[PDB]
Structure formats: structure tokens, C-alpha cells
Amino acid sequence: RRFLCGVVEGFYGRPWVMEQRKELFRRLQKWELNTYLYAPKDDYKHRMFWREMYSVEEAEQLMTLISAAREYEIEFIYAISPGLDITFSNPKEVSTLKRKLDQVSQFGCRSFALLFDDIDHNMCAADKEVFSSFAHAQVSITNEIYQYLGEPETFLFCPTEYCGTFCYPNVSQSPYLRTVGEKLLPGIEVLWTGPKVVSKEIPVESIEEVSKIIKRAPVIWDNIHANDYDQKRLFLGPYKGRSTELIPRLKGVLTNPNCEFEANYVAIHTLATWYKSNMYSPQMALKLALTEWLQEFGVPHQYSSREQFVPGPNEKPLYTAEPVTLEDLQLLADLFYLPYEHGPKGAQMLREFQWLRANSSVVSVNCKGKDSEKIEEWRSRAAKFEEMCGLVMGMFTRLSNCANRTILYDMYSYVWDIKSIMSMVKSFVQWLGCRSHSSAQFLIGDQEPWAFRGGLAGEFQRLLPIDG
């Protein structure tokens, strides 16, 4: 029994380059994964201009990539999303799609996929006069394409309702899914993402409910680490919430990585472990992933003293960089953890800061003459918060010194923003703690720079109501 397990490049934004893809293939072979799906959203010949034919240079790049995939024995699936503007009752569209897929096949590609995600539910008059339903047209064209290609072993189809929240009026009673399941050829696999576009967790019964309609085990398109729906978010936490019992009931698992290429290492590793368990503990998986990931940071750059200056007792010490340690990576992971929850350490820091803010009046003004226990407790908790902020700043400082700076350079902005805001919070907490004897305004320099934090986007964000 073959099982699909791997990565889908299907995020918006700047696409990955050939070097990154080759390194990804090497890592996938190391981690015992077998599937790579190529459907980058912002590739003009993939989705928006699918009708065009690849140029010679693009053809050479594709052939090199496919041969590299062959070297590492990673299945390579090429996807097309013609649903943006394709007309189903016009044979010219079908002929063009066939020619495009044949050009892809002549490069040595073996597996193909057709996607109809994120399109409209309307049909032109030309198709409404032929097909009884939208699903009917989609299934008919998919079946014809599948039969033309010679019935490859692997073939993926993404329905238009790829999540429960897009099923109307529900999953079991959706006419679209019923028609697709009835009329689709048995040899094609079907993508599914769970109850929601970004599903926090997958109950087992939902998969069975979907399978009762599609009459086949689906292939999971998991967006647990996708970050193209709000690109301020970075996700470095482990794979979590998916019970292993789904493995016998699924035909494959395919993960959507973060837009930043180097930020997905841990995620992919966790996924492999999650698979390799049952051919599972999130905490252990994350520990192993970070332990393996640390080896790629190497050592920080240091002065090369291969007639060499050595300082004396009264000379200023040389600049020395400290290595990046396990604790720094764990703190980084907790700072950017999961879409629906934070890491334990970051959540605890936030709760402690909120508590300190709430009880500022205990010692803010004229603390002398008040209850000693409250003063000591508040000051101690403030000190612990200060130490954690210092840990964050030291993490950033040590990460800045890595010899292999590329790992940091692909996610520089997020860590830089979090360390800046931690510094500002530390300054604010100090100002709160010194109010009883310092009546000056809680300024940084001569001003309050956070009045411009986030600019116009930050200002608009600040006015959105929340319950807490």
C-alpha cells in the first residue's frame, strides 16, 4: 500500500528558487518523505496564464528540477489551476490543456494534478446549456484529462469546496460533493483540508463523513503552518492536534509550509516523525526537531588567529560571540508557536505582564506606608519579567552572530520586531516600577516611540474590538 507524505508549495508571495528546492529535496530524502506538490500561487504559467507554453530556459530549469527529484526518489506532482477562466464546453480549451500537460510530461514529469480551489461558483451561458451542474463540468473535464494522460498511478483533484465551512448547507448533504463522488473516476485522489480552511484540529468522525461521500480515502492538504492569510505571523511550533488513527484512513498527508523557506525546517521534521511513528508526543517531537536544527547553525564567526595580538591584563577585551544554544531556540519556538495558541513561555510572559499592569497602583504612587507583602510580591514578579525580557534580548544578540546567517536572514524581521517590542516593554515596566520615587513621564529618550508602532496598519489594528 502506497502512502503519500510530503510538502505542497502552494502559498502566495515570492516563490522559492531552484537552490532552495534542491536543498528541500535533500532534506526530504533524509527525513524519509516521498511527495512534493508544485502549485505555487504566484507562478504566472501555473494559474493565471496556464494556457501559455513554457520557454526554453524555463524548460531547462524544470528538467533539472525533475532530474534532481529523480535522484532523491521524491515523487514530483505538477499542478494546474485552469479554473480561473477555463470554458468547459469549448474543445480548444481542452486541447490547450492537453498540449500543456504533454509539454510537462516531455520534461520527464510523471504525476499531474488539477485544482479548482478559490474560484467562483458561476458558469457561463455556453456551459449552462451543456452541463447540468458545475460539478458535472468539472468532473467531466477532469476525467477526460485523466484518460488522455494514460491513467498515471498518481493523480490529485482539488474540489471547489475543499473545507467544511465552504460546504452548503453541510458536508453530508452537499450536492456538489455527492455529484463529484458519484461521477469521478475511481483512479483519482481527492484533496481535503478538514472542517475549516485553517483547521485547528481534525476529529476522526469528520474524515469518515467525508469518505462516505467521496467513496474513497482523501488526501489531507494541511494548512496548519500556512501563513499567507495574515503574513505578520510566523509559525515554528511542532505538528500538533492530528491523531495518528487517521493514518490508516488517509491516502496521504501534504503540508503547506511557511512562505519563508528556511523557517519550515522544524515543521517538516515534526511531520516526518508524526508519520514515522505509525508506518506520538508533540513535546518530544519538538525537542528532537530543535536538537537536529541546532546543528545547522554551526558556530558564530570568531577572530582568526591562525605575531598575533593577545590582550594584556589592562587591555580592552576582544569582541567575543557566544554560540546559539538550545534554550534560545526553544524560546524562539515559543515566541512563534501556532496559529491558535502561543508557547507556554510566551503565554506565561504575557500573563505575568498583564498581572503586573493590573496591579500597578500598589506601589506606583507613594508606596511607602502601604502593605509590605504586596510591594515585595509585585517587585519580585517584575524582576522575573525583566529577566525573561533579558533572555529574549540575549537570544536575539546571539542569533545575530551565527556564521551561517542565512537561517536568520530569511526570518530577520519577525525576531527583530519581537525583540524591539520586548525592549520597549522592559522600559515601560521599569518606568512603572520607579514611579513612587520618579514622577517623570514614562518616556523612551524624550518621546513615546510606540505612538508610531506599526504605522497606519498598527493604528487600524489597535481600534478593532476584542472581548479581552
Question: DSSP string of 136-190?
Answer: HHHHHHHHHHHHHTT--S-EEEE-S--SGGGSSS-STT-HHHHHHHHHS-TT-EE
Q: Which amino acid is at 43?
A: D
Instruction: Give the whole-angstrom CA distance, residue 67 versus residue 18.
Output: 12
Helices marked H in 8-88: 18-30, 56-71
Could you tell me whether strands 219-222 and 155-158 are parallel, antiparallel, or unpaired per DSSP bridges? unpaired
Instruction: Give the whole-angstrom CA distance, residue 230 versus residue 255.
Output: 18
Adjacent-strand bridge partners of 158: 115
Nearest Cα neighbor of 114 from 89, 84, 134 is 84
Instruction: Give the whole-angstrom CA distance, residue 260 versus residue 243.
Output: 27
By CB atoms closer than 10 A (0-12, 13-18, 19+), residue 447 is: exposed
Question: Experimental technique used?
Answer: cryo-EM
CA distances from 433 to 372, 373, 380, 437 (A): 15, 16, 11, 9
Q: Which amino acid is at 412?
A: Y
CB 225 within 8 A of CB 255: yes
- 113 grid coordinates: 494534478
Question: Which member of 43, 118, 127, 410 is catalytic?
Answer: 118
Residue positions forming the annotated binding site for a protein? 10, 41, 117-118, 162, 228, 256
CB 39 within 8 A of CB 288: no
Q: Which amino acid is at 8?
A: V
Residue partners of 385: CB distance under 8 A and separation at least 6 = 349, 352, 353, 356, 429
CA distances from 93 to 78, 82, 126, 460 (A): 19, 9, 13, 45
Instruction: Give the whole-angstrom CA distance, residue 234 versus residue 410.
Output: 11
Residue partners of 257: CB distance under 8 A and separation at least 6 = 7, 9, 11, 225, 226, 263, 264, 267, 268
Residue positions forming the annotated binding site? 10, 41, 117-118, 162, 228, 256
Instruction: Give the whole-angstrom CA distance, residue 430 versus residue 255.
Output: 43
CB 114 within 8 A of CB 47: no
Instruction: Give the whole-angstrom CA distance, residue 270 versus residue 409.
Output: 23
Instruction: Give the whole-angstrom CA distance, residue 295 versus residue 297.
Output: 6
Nearest Cα neighbor of 171 from 184, 185, 181, 186 is 181
Instruction: Give the whole-angstrom CA distance, residue 356 versus residue 15.
Output: 44
Taking residue 355's Cβ as centre, other Cβ atoms within 10 Å add up to 12
Start-to-end Cα distance in the chain: 50
Q: In this structure, what is the dihedral angle of CA atoms 237, 358, 426, 346, given to the nearest 10 degrees?
A: -10
> Which runs of E-coded beta strand occur in 194-268?
219-222, 252-255
Instruction: Give the whole-angstrom CA distance, residue 88 versus residue 83.
Output: 9
Resolution (A): 3.0
- List the Cα angle 338/164/4 in 5-degree steps: 70
CB 401 within 8 A of CB 300: yes
Taking residue 80's Cβ as centre, other Cβ atoms within 10 Å add up to 20
Q: Is 118 a catalytic residue?
A: yes
Select from 3.20.20.80, 3.40.50.920, 3.90.79.10, 3.40.50.2000 the CATH code of 2-279.
3.20.20.80
Adjacent-strand bridge partners of 252: 4, 219
What phi, psi does 421 have (nearest 5°)? -70, -35
> Which runs of E-coded beta strand occur in 238-381?
252-255
CA distances from 190 to 33, 260, 464 (A): 20, 27, 38
